[PDB]
Amino acid sequence: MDYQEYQQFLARINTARDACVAKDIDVDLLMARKDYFGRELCKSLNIEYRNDVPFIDIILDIRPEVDPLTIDAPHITPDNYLYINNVLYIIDYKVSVSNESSVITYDKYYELTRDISDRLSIPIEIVIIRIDPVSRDLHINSDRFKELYPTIVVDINFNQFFDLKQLLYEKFGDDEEFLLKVAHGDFTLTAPWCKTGCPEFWKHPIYKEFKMSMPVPERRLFEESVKFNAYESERWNTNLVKIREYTKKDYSEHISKSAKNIFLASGFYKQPNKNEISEGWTLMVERVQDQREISKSLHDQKPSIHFIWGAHNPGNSNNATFKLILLSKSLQSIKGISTYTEAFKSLGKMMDIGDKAIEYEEFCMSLKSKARSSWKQIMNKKLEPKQINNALVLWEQQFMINNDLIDKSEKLKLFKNFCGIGKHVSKPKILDFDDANMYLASLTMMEQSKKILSKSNGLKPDNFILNEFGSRIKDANKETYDNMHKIFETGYWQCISDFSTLMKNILSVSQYNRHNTFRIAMCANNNVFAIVFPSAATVVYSIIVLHKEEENIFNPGCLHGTFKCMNGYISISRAIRLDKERCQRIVSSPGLFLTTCLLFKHDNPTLVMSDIMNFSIYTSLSITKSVLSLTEPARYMIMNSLAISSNVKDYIAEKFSPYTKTLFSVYMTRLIKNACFDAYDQRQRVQLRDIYLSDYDITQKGIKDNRELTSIWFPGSVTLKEYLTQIYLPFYFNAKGLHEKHHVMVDLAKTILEIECEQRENIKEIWSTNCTKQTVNLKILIHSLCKNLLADTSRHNHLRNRIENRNNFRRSITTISTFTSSKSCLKIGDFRKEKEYEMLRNAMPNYTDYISTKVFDRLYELLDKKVLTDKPVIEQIMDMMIDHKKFYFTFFNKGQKTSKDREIFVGEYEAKMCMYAVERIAKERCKLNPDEMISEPGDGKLKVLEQKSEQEIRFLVETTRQKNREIDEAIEIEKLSLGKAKGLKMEINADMSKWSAQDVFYKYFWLIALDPILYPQEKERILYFMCNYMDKELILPDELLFNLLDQKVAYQNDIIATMTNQLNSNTVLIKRNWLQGNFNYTSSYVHSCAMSVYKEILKEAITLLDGSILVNSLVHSDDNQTSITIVQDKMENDKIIDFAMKEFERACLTFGCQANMKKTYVTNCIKEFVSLFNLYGEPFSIYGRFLLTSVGDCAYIGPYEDLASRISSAQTAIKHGCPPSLAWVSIAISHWMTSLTYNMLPGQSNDPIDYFPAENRKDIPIELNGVLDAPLSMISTVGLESGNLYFLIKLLSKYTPVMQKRESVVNQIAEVKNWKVEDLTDNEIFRLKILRYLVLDAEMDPSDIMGETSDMRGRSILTPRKFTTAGSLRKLYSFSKYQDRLSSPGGMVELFTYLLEKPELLVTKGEDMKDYMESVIFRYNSKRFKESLSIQNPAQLFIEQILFSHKPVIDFSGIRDKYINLGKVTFTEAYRLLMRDLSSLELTNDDIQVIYSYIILNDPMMITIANTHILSIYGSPQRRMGMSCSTMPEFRNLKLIHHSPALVLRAYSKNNPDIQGADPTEMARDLVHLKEFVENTNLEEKMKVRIAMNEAEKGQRDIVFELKEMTRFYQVCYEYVKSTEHKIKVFILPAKSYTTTDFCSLMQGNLIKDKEWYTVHYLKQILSGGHKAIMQHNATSEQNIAFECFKLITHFADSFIDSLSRSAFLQLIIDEFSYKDVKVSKLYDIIKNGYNRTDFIPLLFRTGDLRQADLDKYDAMKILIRSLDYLNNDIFSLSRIKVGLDEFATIKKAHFSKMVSFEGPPIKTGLLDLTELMKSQDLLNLNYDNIRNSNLISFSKLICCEGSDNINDGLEFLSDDPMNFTEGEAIHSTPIFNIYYSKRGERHMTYRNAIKLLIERETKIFEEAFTFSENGFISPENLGCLEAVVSLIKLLKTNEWSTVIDKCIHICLIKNGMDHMYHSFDVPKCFINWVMFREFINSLPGTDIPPWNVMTENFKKKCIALINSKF
RNA sequence: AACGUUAUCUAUAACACUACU
RNA sequence: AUAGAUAACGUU
Ligand SMILES: [Mg+2]
Ligand SMILES: [Zn+2]
């Protein structure tokens, strides 16, 4: 803070030019940070601030009476001291990331002060305060000091110092002397990881080819560089500098040529237009016709939607039996002849139950009841069909196939020709997407669908989502609620819901369907039925629709035929076969449909809901690859069309491959085709917003929001943000796993082998200068690598140690996560038995046998075979790099949502570890590189983009102004503007084609050869590794060989056979394709070096052009974002852009990369990078993806955790900028999906609303199948604790006393003991009982001082148990060993004893090979791990969870245990039993205290959230103008544990604080703290009692129970001992947030309303100083409230009040007002009797005081009161004072929006009441123009005349000093935009003058609005009319419109000087006769003045209504 | 499958819908 | 620089 110091340091940086003083200024910056932290800490702690006070001075201070010069005081200077309770404390402020400085300072101070403490007879306590800059976590060594001050609420931001340090580094980064000076140490290397190098590497054939490739000098340089040793040489850069100097000539020559190329460049770049697009489309259609088989028949189409629908019949019934009878009767009465009419009639006769409906119902209920009585399914009781009429009924809605009632030939025809059950090169058949007839048919189909579906439902729209979230959504936005109502009312919603429910029924009944039975499924609709035919898995079904009259059904091209029948027509759909995944997608479809509709329609009146519905119903239900082939390429086509420069034409001609098998696909293809042209047309209609820079931050930025762009998928006008949403969202409509393994595997192999062939036949040369494809310029690459390595190793000097520490190089193999997971891995060897396949090995000889096992099992096998050991991992990595000669790889399909899947490669363990080592080296190198982005954690790339955009905008504006100063001065001529400099902002968004396949691997070798921090032996070993790796062999998967060997017709041009010697071997040698994803960091790094070369080229070219350039290149892996800002005046921008693109391509090709010009594009402003956008400084993301993933897959273990998993996605959507109403929509959809999973919808069987005392499902807790209910900040912050938390806040608000109602949460939670339990309502009582007994433990006490937090306790209560099969588990070697141990006598008890001996292994990774083996063996005991190990189908789990809803699935024994002191139980019975049990329980005030203490008081985050909810106050709303990213601050600043939690647990397992890698004293402190926590929570005692009681109950030691209890104990300990986790969570907020309170305020204000956001401030200080698991019983202070109040008062008095009356006004407001319900006199008393008095010098001086000591302290911070009096005799400011002749002392500014928190008696000055001015909203702005252009309505609030004559005298009591006004200037750049900023206005513009102009203008307007009589306003008749109206308004009930009219007419009379008559106004004597009053008001000629007509007429209507209602 | 994350759960061991319609 | 399981996003 202290921004004055900020521009002081900025000026110092600007004037800085020497590296020898850069060190000094950096030290000064660090000292400034130190003293700023010290000042803030002292202010927080309410103590005096000192700075290095001498120790003798404090000795004298504490003991003045003792003589000096007798005890030798040490020369140490403590930062501060505190003497209380006869104890002295030494305080020092430290700002570091580690505690080394703190611990050494502690030791020194302690040792020095022991003797003084001994002699002075007073103990000395050393307190060291440490604050970590990146995360503001607090560290206090002394516990006694923490006891003295329980609450510490320090919260500050170091971002200013970080920015200044960044500026310093960028200003001096190139300076080598500066780099070596500021180095924190020297370059050192640890012991080499290996003792000997690899001598056989030099004879490797790959290295021979390498050597032959380079010319002789390069070979020599390489071979000496690989032998260079940094340790041996006197300088580590010697070889680097030598190589750089050698290559400097060639590098400079190439740079000079590339720069001088700019003149040759022409102005014709690759901008797209209609000609290119048309030619590309023609080429595309020609190519498609060549490849795909085009059809022109409508009958050849495939079903766009696998469904047919019809309206429901209200005339009929709804019972299931009646529906079945109606369906049978309809099927039995088919009229006409057709192919399958006889079969359908036979089916109708086949299920004819006759009139025996009751007997059939009895049978089905009996069977159902028998089934719903067992955990497992019933065996050995074979079912038998029962003959009811002519139907052999086997189960409810199931019918046996009776051959008697069906003809055999008809049966075979129906099953084969139609049903397809039982059946036995061409091209894919697609419809002509460009044929006019096909498009006409598509248009007709869509119009018919819209016509049928748009009809009203005819039924009430009541449903679960609306009922349970209407209030929340409507409060969020009324428009969204109305749109949802329109969605629900239409026929589209009914159709989609019926389809979903019917498809769910189909899925349910298809499980138990046999091969000779058929099922019937019904939905809510009485006309829609589904028939499910026998199956084997796949689901085969047909849809049947009964309708009164034909051609009235929704036919998405899937209707097989319509036939006449009784009471109308029956429509049969074609037989549909589907997979379970698509089945579940259809089931979940309604959520996707509703979300898509709401997202598309959100805030867009020009769009029509019908078109959005029509498009969404096809997008959501599209489960075919046809729409997949369209959604993906559309993004690139439309973006390139909108882009400034892109090669869209090629893309269309040789990439866009449409696959249109449906008419909807043709429609969407036409939509995309039109969108391309229309996007090219409208690219110039994008307009940027006006940047409101602040000279220290950028606010109100981004891109203007106006709808001019035509919408793509439907007619309408959309905003650019909405345009991007329409472009990008459809990609997320796709479904993953739509590829069939056969074809996708074949295509992946084809692509890989084709790339291999291309690289073998053509690519033979490695180094070239002409930029050959797949070639690298050697010289340039070497020079760039040398420069980048030098810079990186100069940045940090201990790189090798950091690499070893962070990547666990020293620790064991078992301590690395990636080596112990359960991912797939490959094993090679003689594995004949396990795989058994025989035909493959027999026919095909050369089979490199392989198997796919798990990583952890492979590691266990390797450890068992003694191949690997517990030695440091890196040594074993080197040993394996030498030993492992051969590498093998396999591949499979990722199953992504793209048109073509991305192949995924799996390698062996040895390759995994060696690649891990190399890639971690590269990653730790890249972490220092600013350009590298993978180093930045996830979601921080958005922040990087925002920072780059804002800094480049700043550079552009500054450079433009600086260059055009002279021209602007000359202007205030057209030729001068012509010759003035111009700006150009360009954004290149690029990706690289075939990043892994097409790459010169040799270029990485040099990156290792020139590496300094590697010893020559390590270099040799790594190079031998890569030489072996380039000889990798990819193994064809066994399935590919299976389906290739079973063709019987050889392929014409089989590349696989050619590479496999006609399938004679299953291994293919791959050389130049380093596998997909193996070397991300390495590749990325090299690309960053290439971007650095490009940056140098551009800078050199601009120097030749004599201009300014700023280039920012961001490189993730292959996706590159390059931003260029060029200011120059030589030639037009087109030549510059063409040159930039050409040289970008050249540089990208230089380093062996290849820019995908098809997907690479150029934009003026929009910067897309890894799916993150930055329109213009404004971050943006397509949050629709997270919204659509709300109904994704989940664990399906139980309702609560699935609700949690989907709320997770809802939260993630919120974090990306989703509006609150859409967030509620997503949450509601998630709740609906979870409810539908377990049949919990309202009215259904498992609906628990009836069984609980709840008005609606909101009252039921989440764990009891309730619904979420909390404000958005609650869910987004605490993560599902929001339910209980919000319930408790509601309780506090409802039941706390009025006096403490508005106090802090701590005061209320302490006063809770005074509640009357008899008042609580049942619902509340039930919820409190559930919290107290089901969640908490009864043994806890309200007097506890430390307790477990909600994070350390579970929440799930009801969890079904499924008797799942064991699985195969055969390939698992570790499983075989575990089974042998299990069969071994007494092995398990020995393993359990070992685990008890080291219990920390239960919750922490083992650090030893034996420990890892024991943990792996023990992990098999848990059935969950064994079940998860085998492959599973999420759809199968979902279906089984649906099916087992009614079976006893809840084990009530566990739920009973939770309360004091039979088998499985159903959900409904569980609810009944739980209510019966909780009825017997009881509550008391102590129980409520326990609940509140254990739920709220534990976590400081909970306290902060409760406070920010209770004390929130919302200010003036305003539209969201500029977004900005911000990370969430840590809510737990205090840290009680220092070591890592795993280390602390390891130490606590024993009692030895001294463990490996453990600091002794710090470890002892941590162990003491953990022991205190354990003994205070009684957790050890509770565990011991539990295990003892269980042992007594069983009679023998249930050892597994002991293991589980130990696991729970250590888990709770681990979660308590958690330090800061440094989670990276980014939120898009309307403003920048630095502190925690600012972040909370922005979050609260952003998530309340869609249209606008609010400014939120709190009545009291929300934060609380406490630890994670310690109850807090003390509130905070009020110092910050006083600070805010007095800052606001002083600044308001100075800015808006006349100087003469300022002191009197301040005295009065101190006298009687109060701020935030706190008397301002109390605040003045607090500030006066406080040590923070130097911040209020002017305020004190305006009341005298200051005791002559404040001046002394102020002088010490950087002089007599008598001087001050004369100096400030002139200056009348209340916040600004001048202590010296020029020295100025001021008070920090504050936002005026908090001013609403003031109240008191009115302050009447003249005709103005300043109290309303504080209470006002509009007139608090600082801009003169804003004040002068207000409305009379806002000013009207200030009118209090009581006998004034003129306006001027009353207005005299207003500030006459000139204020600031905002003015703007044009930027004159390629993207044209304005710049608005505030500056000091001249004298003639003041608050007085602004008020005068506003009042005169508004009074004239309102006067001419009320000139009723033609004579004039002052005419006697108009005066009489005004007297009449004032009499009327005074007599009748006061109205706000009446008051504003009265004030306006009164001020008009004041302006005309008629007030004396105004105060003489009365009821006219010529007029209580109300009838003639009505006559007169009805006679009033309401004028049509555009501003005033509305209020006048509304006033007239209100008055006439009131007078009518009066009588 | 590698990565970069983010958030959720931590048990000893033959049948759904059947609806405001 | 928790483990296990699951899910989602982005890159390869
Ligand atoms: Mg990209
Ligand atoms: Zn008056």
mmCIF file of all heavy atoms in Angstrom, chain A residues 1227-1239:
data_model
loop_
_atom_site.group_PDB
_atom_site.id
_atom_site.type_symbol
_atom_site.label_atom_id
_atom_site.label_comp_id
_atom_site.label_asym_id
_atom_site.label_seq_id
_atom_site.Cartn_x
_atom_site.Cartn_y
_atom_site.Cartn_z
ATOM 1 N N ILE A 1227 -27.709 -26.824 -10.443
ATOM 2 C CA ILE A 1227 -27.873 -27.509 -9.163
ATOM 3 C C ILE A 1227 -29.193 -28.271 -9.133
ATOM 4 O O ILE A 1227 -29.261 -29.414 -8.661
ATOM 5 C CB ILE A 1227 -27.767 -26.503 -8.005
ATOM 6 C CG1 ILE A 1227 -26.315 -26.071 -7.813
ATOM 7 C CG2 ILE A 1227 -28.313 -27.099 -6.722
ATOM 8 C CD1 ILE A 1227 -26.144 -24.929 -6.842
ATOM 9 N N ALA A 1228 -30.261 -27.650 -9.635
ATOM 10 C CA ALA A 1228 -31.560 -28.309 -9.680
ATOM 11 C C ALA A 1228 -31.528 -29.530 -10.585
ATOM 12 O O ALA A 1228 -32.122 -30.564 -10.263
ATOM 13 C CB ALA A 1228 -32.628 -27.325 -10.152
ATOM 14 N N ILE A 1229 -30.854 -29.424 -11.729
ATOM 15 C CA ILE A 1229 -30.734 -30.566 -12.629
ATOM 16 C C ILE A 1229 -29.973 -31.697 -11.951
ATOM 17 O O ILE A 1229 -30.329 -32.874 -12.085
ATOM 18 C CB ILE A 1229 -30.065 -30.142 -13.949
ATOM 19 C CG1 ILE A 1229 -30.908 -29.091 -14.665
ATOM 20 C CG2 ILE A 1229 -29.879 -31.329 -14.845
ATOM 21 C CD1 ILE A 1229 -32.275 -29.579 -15.051
ATOM 22 N N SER A 1230 -28.908 -31.361 -11.223
ATOM 23 C CA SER A 1230 -28.160 -32.381 -10.496
ATOM 24 C C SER A 1230 -29.034 -33.065 -9.452
ATOM 25 O O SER A 1230 -29.008 -34.295 -9.313
ATOM 26 C CB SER A 1230 -26.933 -31.755 -9.841
ATOM 27 O OG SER A 1230 -26.227 -30.942 -10.763
ATOM 28 N N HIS A 1231 -29.818 -32.278 -8.710
ATOM 29 C CA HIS A 1231 -30.715 -32.856 -7.716
ATOM 30 C C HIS A 1231 -31.749 -33.759 -8.373
ATOM 31 O O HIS A 1231 -32.056 -34.839 -7.859
ATOM 32 C CB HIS A 1231 -31.402 -31.750 -6.919
ATOM 33 C CG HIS A 1231 -30.569 -31.206 -5.804
ATOM 34 N ND1 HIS A 1231 -29.612 -30.234 -5.998
ATOM 35 C CD2 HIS A 1231 -30.549 -31.496 -4.482
ATOM 36 C CE1 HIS A 1231 -29.038 -29.949 -4.842
ATOM 37 N NE2 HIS A 1231 -29.588 -30.702 -3.908
ATOM 38 N N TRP A 1232 -32.300 -33.326 -9.508
ATOM 39 C CA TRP A 1232 -33.285 -34.134 -10.215
ATOM 40 C C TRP A 1232 -32.679 -35.445 -10.692
ATOM 41 O O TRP A 1232 -33.312 -36.501 -10.590
ATOM 42 C CB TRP A 1232 -33.859 -33.344 -11.389
ATOM 43 C CG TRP A 1232 -34.597 -34.179 -12.384
ATOM 44 C CD1 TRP A 1232 -35.927 -34.473 -12.378
ATOM 45 C CD2 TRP A 1232 -34.050 -34.819 -13.542
ATOM 46 N NE1 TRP A 1232 -36.243 -35.261 -13.456
ATOM 47 C CE2 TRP A 1232 -35.106 -35.488 -14.187
ATOM 48 C CE3 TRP A 1232 -32.769 -34.893 -14.094
ATOM 49 C CZ2 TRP A 1232 -34.921 -36.222 -15.355
ATOM 50 C CZ3 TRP A 1232 -32.587 -35.622 -15.253
ATOM 51 C CH2 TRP A 1232 -33.656 -36.276 -15.871
ATOM 52 N N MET A 1233 -31.457 -35.399 -11.223
ATOM 53 C CA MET A 1233 -30.803 -36.622 -11.676
ATOM 54 C C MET A 1233 -30.549 -37.573 -10.515
ATOM 55 O O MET A 1233 -30.814 -38.779 -10.619
ATOM 56 C CB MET A 1233 -29.495 -36.284 -12.389
ATOM 57 C CG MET A 1233 -28.712 -37.497 -12.854
ATOM 58 S SD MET A 1233 -29.742 -38.714 -13.695
ATOM 59 C CE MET A 1233 -28.575 -39.394 -14.870
ATOM 60 N N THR A 1234 -30.048 -37.049 -9.395
ATOM 61 C CA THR A 1234 -29.798 -37.900 -8.236
ATOM 62 C C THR A 1234 -31.091 -38.514 -7.717
ATOM 63 O O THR A 1234 -31.127 -39.696 -7.358
ATOM 64 C CB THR A 1234 -29.107 -37.104 -7.134
ATOM 65 O OG1 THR A 1234 -29.832 -35.891 -6.895
ATOM 66 C CG2 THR A 1234 -27.685 -36.766 -7.540
ATOM 67 N N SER A 1235 -32.163 -37.722 -7.667
ATOM 68 C CA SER A 1235 -33.452 -38.239 -7.224
ATOM 69 C C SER A 1235 -33.970 -39.320 -8.163
ATOM 70 O O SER A 1235 -34.488 -40.348 -7.712
ATOM 71 C CB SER A 1235 -34.457 -37.095 -7.117
ATOM 72 O OG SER A 1235 -35.783 -37.582 -7.137
ATOM 73 N N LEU A 1236 -33.839 -39.104 -9.472
ATOM 74 C CA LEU A 1236 -34.303 -40.089 -10.440
ATOM 75 C C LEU A 1236 -33.479 -41.365 -10.377
ATOM 76 O O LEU A 1236 -33.981 -42.442 -10.717
ATOM 77 C CB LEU A 1236 -34.264 -39.491 -11.845
ATOM 78 C CG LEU A 1236 -34.735 -40.354 -13.013
ATOM 79 C CD1 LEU A 1236 -35.596 -39.533 -13.953
ATOM 80 C CD2 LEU A 1236 -33.542 -40.928 -13.755
ATOM 81 N N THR A 1237 -32.220 -41.267 -9.950
ATOM 82 C CA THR A 1237 -31.386 -42.461 -9.843
ATOM 83 C C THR A 1237 -31.958 -43.447 -8.831
ATOM 84 O O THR A 1237 -31.957 -44.660 -9.068
ATOM 85 C CB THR A 1237 -29.959 -42.073 -9.464
ATOM 86 O OG1 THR A 1237 -29.434 -41.164 -10.438
ATOM 87 C CG2 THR A 1237 -29.071 -43.303 -9.404
ATOM 88 N N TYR A 1238 -32.459 -42.947 -7.700
ATOM 89 C CA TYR A 1238 -32.928 -43.803 -6.617
ATOM 90 C C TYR A 1238 -34.431 -43.683 -6.380
ATOM 91 O O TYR A 1238 -34.903 -43.995 -5.282
ATOM 92 C CB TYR A 1238 -32.166 -43.492 -5.329
ATOM 93 C CG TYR A 1238 -30.682 -43.743 -5.427
ATOM 94 C CD1 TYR A 1238 -29.789 -42.695 -5.594
ATOM 95 C CD2 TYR A 1238 -30.171 -45.032 -5.353
ATOM 96 C CE1 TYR A 1238 -28.431 -42.922 -5.684
ATOM 97 C CE2 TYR A 1238 -28.816 -45.269 -5.442
ATOM 98 C CZ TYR A 1238 -27.950 -44.211 -5.608
ATOM 99 O OH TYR A 1238 -26.598 -44.445 -5.698
ATOM 100 N N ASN A 1239 -35.189 -43.243 -7.384
ATOM 101 C CA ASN A 1239 -36.650 -43.181 -7.319
ATOM 102 C C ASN A 1239 -37.121 -42.328 -6.139
ATOM 103 O O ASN A 1239 -37.930 -42.751 -5.313
ATOM 104 C CB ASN A 1239 -37.252 -44.587 -7.247
ATOM 105 C CG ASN A 1239 -36.958 -45.409 -8.480
ATOM 106 O OD1 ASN A 1239 -36.249 -46.413 -8.416
ATOM 107 N ND2 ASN A 1239 -37.504 -44.992 -9.616
#
